[PDB]
Amino acid sequence: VKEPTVSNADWSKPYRPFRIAGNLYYIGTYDLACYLITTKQGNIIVNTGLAASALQIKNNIKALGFKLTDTKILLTTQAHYDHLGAMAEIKKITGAKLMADEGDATVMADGGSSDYAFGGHGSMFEPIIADRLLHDKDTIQLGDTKLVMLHHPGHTKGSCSFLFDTKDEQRSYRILIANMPTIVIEKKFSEVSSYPGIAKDYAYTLQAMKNLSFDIWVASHASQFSMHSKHKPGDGYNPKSFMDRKGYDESLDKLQKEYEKHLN
Ligand SMILES: [Co+2]
Ligand SMILES: [Zn+2]
Ligand SMILES: [Zn+2]
């Protein structure tokens, strides 16, 4: 396994973990977004960072006063090394069930060596095998929390978002953990031959994502939802700073124009 060169220091830069809304917490790096969802029956972790991120993740969970041994479920939005780098390790240590969008099961099982965009040069992250293959609109229940997986292909063949309700003592929130449909290739869709449905998948995702409704959206990278504009370490609890429909729409507009060009 050889993790590709990382030029962006913020991918490994530690960041102080915080509560976003209800039982949703941010436990990722300065730019690689990882989430903890805490329930009465244990916890869900969504994403890791790079290979070395396992230490920070364990520490972040601890720092919020939760227990790593309460981890029951592992999810990802995206089978790329920047979001699955430490997943094999976290799964080993926790013994949690990994649930994955069927579209990415294969790439995950080979550590990214069959990746349509970065394949052919061996494993880019430690292979993981999912205990559950999820399809569009499958639900994941733990205690009183229920997640809906949304198949949002294109970024990866199985990239996906999660839609779920949480509550604090005053209010309930509909949260989208979105995988934004960014384009990873530099060439035209028509030339990406080992992913024949790539253009149709982007078209489907862009349309499906525009029509979603929620109170709060977050993304796979902190920068993609401007997390550092909405929250500083020490802010305390403030779900409302993550209410940002305009931000979401502006982002999908940009990604729509990108889709039209075919690349970046
Ligand atoms: Co299936
Ligand atoms: Zn990616
Ligand atoms: Zn990424």
Numbering used by the authors: 28 to 45, 47 to 57, 66 to 76, 78 to 87, 89 to 161, 164 to 192, 194 to 252, 254 to 306
Pull text from the paper.
Results show that LRA-12 exhibits a broad spectrum profile, since penicillins, cephalosporins, cephamycins and even carbapenems were hydrolyzed, with kcat/Km values ranging from 0.16 to 1.75 μM-1.s-1. In this sense, both LRA-12 and GOB enzymes present the highest carbapenemase activity among class B3 MBLs.
Metagenomic LRA-12 crystallized in space group P 1 21 1, and crystals diffracted at a final resolution of 2.1 Å. The refined structure consists in two monomers per asymmetric unit. The overall structure of LRA-12 conserves the main structural features of a class B β-lactamase, showing an αβ/βα sandwich in which α-helices are exposed to the solvent and surround a compact core of β-sheets. Interestingly, a cobalt ion was modeled between the two monomers of LRA-12 in the asymmetric unit, bound to Glu140-Oε and His175-Nε2 in a tetrahedral coordination. The catalytic cavity has a tridimensional geometry of a shallow cleft having 150–170 Å3, similar to what was reported for GOB-18 (150–200 Å3). The metal-binding site 1 is defined by Gln116, His118, and His196 (site QHH), which is uniquely found in this enzyme and in GOB β-lactamases; zinc-binding site 2 is constituted by Asp120, His121, and His263 (site DHH). In LRA-12, a water molecule occupies the position of Ser221 lateral chain in FEZ-1/BJP-1, forcing the side chain of Met221 to point outwards from the active site, which enables a displacement of the β11-α5 loop (containing Met221) that carries it, thus increasing the size of the cavity; compared to FEZ-1, BJP-1, and L1, the Cα of residue at 221 is displaced 2.70, 2.72 and 3.06 Å, respectively.
